[PDB]
Enzyme design. Structure first.
Site, PDB file in Angstrom:
ATOM      1  N   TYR A  36     -46.568  60.821  27.802  1.00 34.66           N
ATOM      2  CA  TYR A  36     -45.541  61.793  28.083  1.00 34.66           C
ATOM      3  C   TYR A  36     -45.527  62.224  29.373  1.00 34.66           C
ATOM      4  CZ  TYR A  36     -45.335  62.106  22.761  1.00 34.66           C
ATOM      5  OH  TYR A  36     -45.437  62.004  21.404  1.00 34.66           O
TER       6      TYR A  36
ATOM      7  N   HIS B 142     -54.262  60.246  12.302  1.00 37.22           N
ATOM      8  CA  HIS B 142     -55.087  59.410  12.879  1.00 37.22           C
ATOM      9  C   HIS B 142     -56.672  59.717  12.502  1.00 37.22           C
ATOM     10  CE1 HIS B 142     -51.962  56.918  14.749  1.00 37.22           C
ATOM     11  NE2 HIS B 142     -51.471  57.766  15.004  1.00 37.22           N
TER      12      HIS B 142
ATOM     13  N   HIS C  93     -46.620  67.135  19.869  1.00 39.61           N
ATOM     14  CA  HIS C  93     -46.426  65.609  19.732  1.00 39.61           C
ATOM     15  C   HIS C  93     -45.013  65.336  19.441  1.00 39.61           C
ATOM     16  CE1 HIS C  93     -48.287  61.782  19.471  1.00 39.61           C
ATOM     17  NE2 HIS C  93     -47.629  61.598  18.195  1.00 39.61           N
TER      18      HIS C  93
ATOM     19  N   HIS D 240     -42.721  59.995  13.150  1.00 44.84           N
ATOM     20  CA  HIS D 240     -42.923  58.809  14.076  1.00 44.84           C
ATOM     21  C   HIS D 240     -43.155  57.627  13.033  1.00 44.84           C
ATOM     22  CE1 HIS D 240     -43.708  60.484  18.420  1.00 44.84           C
ATOM     23  NE2 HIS D 240     -42.621  60.271  17.959  1.00 44.84           N
TER      24      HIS D 240
ATOM     25  N   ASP E 193     -45.263  55.142  12.734  1.00 48.31           N
ATOM     26  CA  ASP E 193     -46.585  55.129  12.258  1.00 48.31           C
ATOM     27  C   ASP E 193     -47.109  56.229  11.244  1.00 48.31           C
ATOM     28  OD1 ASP E 193     -46.587  56.656  14.393  1.00 48.31           O
ATOM     29  OD2 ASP E 193     -48.819  56.269  14.600  1.00 48.31           O
ATOM     30  N   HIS E 194     -46.233  57.069  10.801  1.00 48.58           N
ATOM     31  CA  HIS E 194     -46.571  58.074   9.814  1.00 48.58           C
ATOM     32  C   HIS E 194     -45.540  58.404   8.645  1.00 48.58           C
ATOM     33  CE1 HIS E 194     -50.084  58.798  12.444  1.00 48.58           C
ATOM     34  NE2 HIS E 194     -49.126  59.076  13.543  1.00 48.58           N
TER      35      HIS E 194
ATOM     36  N   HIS F 283     -45.333  64.281  11.175  1.00 44.96           N
ATOM     37  CA  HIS F 283     -44.219  64.264  12.036  1.00 44.96           C
ATOM     38  C   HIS F 283     -43.707  62.828  11.838  1.00 44.96           C
ATOM     39  CE1 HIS F 283     -47.340  62.105  14.325  1.00 44.96           C
ATOM     40  NE2 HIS F 283     -46.482  61.339  14.897  1.00 44.96           N
TER      41      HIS F 283
END
Ligand SMILES: C=C1CO[C@H]([C@@](C=O)(NC(=O)[C@H](C(=O)O)c2ccc(O)cc2)OC)N=C1C(=O)O
Ligand SMILES: C=C1CO[C@H]([C@@](C=O)(NC(=O)[C@H](C(=O)O)c2ccc(O)cc2)OC)N=C1C(=O)O
Ligand SMILES: C=C1CO[C@H]([C@@](C=O)(NC(=O)[C@H](C(=O)O)c2ccc(O)cc2)OC)N=C1C(=O)O
Ligand SMILES: C=C1CO[C@H]([C@@](C=O)(NC(=O)[C@H](C(=O)O)c2ccc(O)cc2)OC)N=C1C(=O)O
Ligand SMILES: [Cu+2]
Ligand SMILES: [Cu+2]
Ligand SMILES: [Cu+2]
Ligand SMILES: [Cu+2]
Ligand SMILES: [Cu+2]
Ligand SMILES: [Cu+2]
Ligand SMILES: [Cu+2]
Ligand SMILES: [Cu+2]
Lengths: 266, 266, 266, 266
Positions: C190, C224, C159, C85, C87-88, C83
């Site tokens: 969320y 993660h 997510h 985001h 951090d990815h 996805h």
């Protein structure tokens, strides 16, 4: 030696390009497209909303009809779409430039709209139109409000990955009218079974048939009026033979199941 | 009542769509387009570069010619453009999808390429093609290097705001050959004087004439070969009557000055 | 009077930014990210594939590790994402510029990637990163092939709307290994119930739990590593305690159901 | 071993984030930004125009000030920009979402705005902000009209490739006031000589100095008020020491020539 072929234009039946005067659907909802292409104008106190616009060459005719309804170009605040094919989202680019309206669409329709319909999963580059950008990304079930009128999006993937039905409540004779603008459920010339560009195509159509059945639906409209049995040309009798949402989904599923079996046999 | 007109396809002369075998321009530079549309392939040790691709329907023919030169589809690393009109940047979208090549262009050409040529300052939506995205934004004078071959961009705005000339040094008979791929300097049917979409149009053309005169130029090529007096069909004699960069710019300015005076008188 | 607050940077735990040497997962699959952020390199005969890239500042470290594996920058052909985001998908923009690789993603991830993660449905503009464009739009179940290695996408929205699991078959000890790279199933902070930006959020998570259970899954990896019980730091024992796909989905659903009840009570 | 560094946020002096009440510049022009960041509101009969918006976190403050001027959010029709850096175009994305206003910009500013300021020719990814899309592409000298007020764009490339000055005629004491909103002419920490990302950087600055001198200019404003000697905090005396357009361009060129010589000596 033969040369490479000339580009072929996206031609349609004349009735898809036959202008018509505004036809009232409910107290604030008007059909302002052509005889065989739906383009719905919803007039609020705080501006106007347009659902679909038809072919690319319909932009001027739409603005003419908006003006007959008293809607100046800059009064159009929002454009909503069933799906981003050339015969339904054709004039969106030109309408944005001339009205300042925003486009709200889901991610699949936005990506297709941004390609101008090019690289279609089934039609390739045969139905390209001027591309346009989505200003707001819409999720399934999300409510879009203009002038106090709530528009609810219902994802019905199939005809296109981003195919969407829009529902809202108008009035007529002092009583509420739950209008459902359901997208196309056809698969004209599609490869349904084992499509590498659309591997879950059949599952999506099946769920979309169920989604259409469950819509809040006092009055059903479709991007092609003949799909829901409207006849925009006969005036105030245009909606007399219109189908229910259940009849539309059921008629579509039988045509889909017959095409699926014919595909197995062809 | 007459319906709205059908969409008109962008048709061109047959010779613009007449495939031709690869014609060698220098040790690494080949014309691989059609007889009347330039598409240059530069082959390096670390991959191939393509300058212009012609019409949208030329994508397959280009890949066929690349394969005749030993260039597999994924070996194409970079696409460069003169300007983003349908007859020069037509197949860029399809080429990116099938080769993984990146497109380098200036901001004006990138914005036009991203619209698929729609909303042209002069042609409106008459020459729309599948849109494509630029992966690298290029500034004036910036050097783009593939396989050790340096390509230098020279902005010559006019025909389009993003019109660009590309220069690089090849070899032939062991001697250097400074190739100049200069963009079109025509203004076919343009309004030159007091154009609200392009108020500095005349000043840009004037500076572009001077830019073309000063290019490093042992061999001149143009997107339309007839503009620089090439004849791709006669094989190894194709470049015999080719113009200099000075003769090209001068012939273009006289045609421009004559059209400007005719516009004042029309 | 107090001024408007300064911009706050997206800070993370140090272990998310702790570089590590390439850790072999199977014959062609390597973890080349950091100790707490997964970045998978799949090496084929016809180029390399990268799944996720971690934080924006990891771009150089990824290219260093690719070079330790013998992969030159231009040998990277494809970037795949769980996805979009920060951090990815942080370094995707820089990786495209320096490698020429293409990005394949579904429409929801492409639209989010094109915003640079801005206007997040839950995080607003708190996790913005340099935006990047998707070169190929992927449908659910679609197969992406590089060097003969087939990558299959499995949509697991939740997510993020575009959350995707990627499955492929590698080898080890001469036997096949069905690797499943499943996306995050968390909902950190969320609003789950009655979210206007995501009205079907709970239904999507539920179907995604079922999707993860049914994945072809000999070895499970997550963006993660702690989510699937990997420990990249202990070397060849990193995968010893890794969860099954069924255990991952079940552990995620219980955490989701507990957060849902806590949300009702908070 | 040291981890990779955390992301650094774009921090600025507190006075850049110090809100101020609307300060009237002329009959329809108001400074509604902060004490050290210009954000101009021009109020017409047919809607409002905003030139620059300052930092990303200023979006709410701008809408508050618009409401103090009687401008509802949806009354903002157009956003114009000097250049697309985080401290001048920061809140454009959020403003578009909440007002429905369109953004008009040239191609260079549009491409930079679409990257959210990432991949800056000089600052890299250090000043990224939420990206936004341009709805209308503007050429040099083109006139943009809202409510009968004509805005003329004057390209002054240098600080950014898309740097633009905006001129328009307001009134005061019944007499015309030719307002010139000229962009920054600084090059803070830029490499001027032989810059591969900007090879014609020095030539562009030189022509831009001349462009600023020739602007129609009764009152000069700049994105940073100190650049033109405004002091927004002292109220009705804010413009007392403001520079002419000639003095601004001349002061900028001497600073540029001194930095150029210092660069040769550093
Ligand atoms: C069932 C139909 C009738 O056809 C139109 C469609 C398909 O979506 N195709 C066409 O207009 C033509 C056709 O289907 O024959 C066509 C013509 C040329 C071409 O290159 C591709 C298609 O619109 C694109 N829409 C619907 C719908 O239910 O919405
Ligand atoms: C001088 C020419 C010859 O014309 C092509 C051009 C104009 O750029 N126009 C055309 O192909 C047609 C023409 O100019 O008549 C045309 C046809 C249909 C249409 O809707 C618009 C234009 O290519 C777009 N290019 C150059 C050039 O020097 O590059
Ligand atoms: C469950 C987690 C742990 O948190 C990260 C996340 C959320 O997706 N949030 C964060 O990094 C922070 C957090 O959640 O506290 C954070 C910090 C600042 C901020 O403005 C927003 C979020 O990544 C964005 N990812 C996952 C995942 O499963 O993928
Ligand atoms: C001359 C100035 C003063 O600085 C700002 C600028 C540069 O454009 N830089 C900065 O804000 C900082 C600086 O220049 O030191 C900075 C801080 C962090 C960073 O990563 C990059 C720059 O705005 C981006 N604008 C102008 C202008 O004339 O417009
Ligand atoms: Cu359709
Ligand atoms: Cu249709
Ligand atoms: Cu042209
Ligand atoms: Cu041409
Ligand atoms: Cu996440
Ligand atoms: Cu995460
Ligand atoms: Cu700046
Ligand atoms: Cu600044």
């Amino acid at each position: 030696e033969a040369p490479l072929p000339q580009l072929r234009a996206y031609t349609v039946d004349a009735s898809w390009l036959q202008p018509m005067a505004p036809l009232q659907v409910a107290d604030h909802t008007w059909q302002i497209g052509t005889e065989d292409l739906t383009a719905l104008l919803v007039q609020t106190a705080e501006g106007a909303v347009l659902l679909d616009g038809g072919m690319p060459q319909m932009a001027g005719h739409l603005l003419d009809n908006m003006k007959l309804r008293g809607v100046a170009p800059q009064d159009l605040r929002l454009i909503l779409l069933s799906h981003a094919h050339a015969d339904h989202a054709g004039p969106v680019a030109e309408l944005k430039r001339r009205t300042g309206a925003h486009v709200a669409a889901n991610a699949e329709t936005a990506v297709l709209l941004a390609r101008g319909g090019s690289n279609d999963l089934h039609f390739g580059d045969g139905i390209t139109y001027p591309p346009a950008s989505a200003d707001r990304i819409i999720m399934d079930g999300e409510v879009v409000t203009v002038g106090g009128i709530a528009f609810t999006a219902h994802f019905m993937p199939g005809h296109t990955p981003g195919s969407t039905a829009w529902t809202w409540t108008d009035t007529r004779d002092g009583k509420p009218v739950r209008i459902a603008y359901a997208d196309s459920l056809s698969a004209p010339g599609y490869q349904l079974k084992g499509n590498p560009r659309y591997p879950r195509l059949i599952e999506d159509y099946k769920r979309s048939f169920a989604t259409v059945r469950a819509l809040p639906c006092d009055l059903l409209l479709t991007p092609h009026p003949g799909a829901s049995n409207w006849n925009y040309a006969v005036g105030s009798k245009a909606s007399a033979e219109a189908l229910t949402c259940n009849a539309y989904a059921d008629a579509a599923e039988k045509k889909f199941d017959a095409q699926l079996a014919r595909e197995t046999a062809g």
